[PDB]
């Protein structure tokens, strides 16, 4: 299947408390693999996945220098945007960027992206053509115009089509035992009493990779998507994921409800019920 390289970047000002906090967190698919954090004791890019041990010192030096340069750019940006929006120096503000690319199973580019937010709202984004920008407001229109005059989209496109895909391919090769693995969900159902002669049934799916999964509850062959509570699929601390989904049903009738689990590591989807 397809694969992605994504960097989540955050710059947050702290007026009165020194320089902004600056972080870059890199993912291949759903797995964290590198990080830079300006608040660390000795700020440098660090491996976050075991297979990144395969890069030499020159990798960590270059990425570190690039991160430190980016940190300085974002510091400047925070001050620039205060001017664009006519805001005071006393308040904290946040810039966010998601930057990366996706390739097909053949390693060829499917999609590139670069999206910016300010204080949690859309600011500017590269369009899917990899040639033009969309600006969400008049401040971002200033940025768009600078980037047009500097040829920024062409520089960015060269990264997305070149560097980004080439490094993604390399990370997938080096990390193949981790990244191309499948860990099958293990499921179970729990049962909780309620007032009013009703009962919560909760279907759990544990230990799975990759993160994409579907959990449904059925009564008499029909999915109950409207009545279900669930959590977003969530990391479990060791590179796997988990999820649950619950439904509220009449006491005495729990035998008629079935949880269904669909995942890459389940040749046939799991069907299960509460086990008294």
């Amino acid at each position: 299947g397809p694969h992605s390289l994504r960097y989540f970047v955050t710059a947050v000002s702290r007026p009165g408390l020194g320089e902004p906090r600056y972080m870059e967190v890199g993912y291949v698919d759903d797995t964290e693999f590198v990080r830079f954090d300006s608040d660390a004791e000795n700020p440098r890019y660090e491996p976050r996945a075991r297979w990144m041990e395969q890069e030499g010192p020159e990798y960590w030096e270059r990425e570190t220098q690039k991160a430190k340069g980016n940190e300085q750019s974002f510091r400047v940006d925070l001050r620039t945007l205060l001017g664009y929006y006519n805001q005071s120096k006393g308040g904290s503000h946040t810039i966010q960027v998601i930057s990366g690319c996706e390739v097909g199973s053949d390693g060829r580019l499917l999609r590139g992206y670069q999206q910016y937010a300010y204080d949690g709202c859309d600011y500017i984004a590269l369009n899917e053509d990899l040639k033009t920008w969309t600006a969400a407001d008049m401040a971002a229109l200033i940025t768009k115009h600078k980037w047009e005059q500097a040829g920024e989209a062409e520089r960015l496109r060269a990264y997305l089509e070149g560097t980004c895909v080439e490094w993604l391919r390399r990370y997938l090769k080096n990390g193949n035992a981790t990244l191309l693995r499948t860990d099958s969900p293990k499921a179970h159902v729990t049962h909780h009493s309620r007032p009013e002669d009703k009962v919560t049934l909760r279907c759990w799916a544990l230990g799975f990779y990759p993160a994409d999964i579907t959990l449904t509850w059925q009564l008499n062959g029909e999915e109950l998507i409207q009545d279900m509570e669930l959590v977003e699929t969530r990391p479990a601390g060791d590179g796997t994921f988990q999820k649950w989904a619950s439904v509220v049903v009449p006491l005495g009738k729990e035998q008629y409800y079935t949880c269904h689990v669909y995942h890459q590591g389940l040749p046939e989807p799991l069907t299960l019920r509460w086990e008294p």
């Binding site: 750019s73 940006d77 620039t80 930057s99 910016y116 500017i124 960015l156 990264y159």
Partner: peptide
């Protein structure tokens, strides 16, 4: 792997 970002 990471891009060198432009100022805004």
């Amino acid at each position: 792997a990471v891009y060198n970002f432009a100022t805004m």
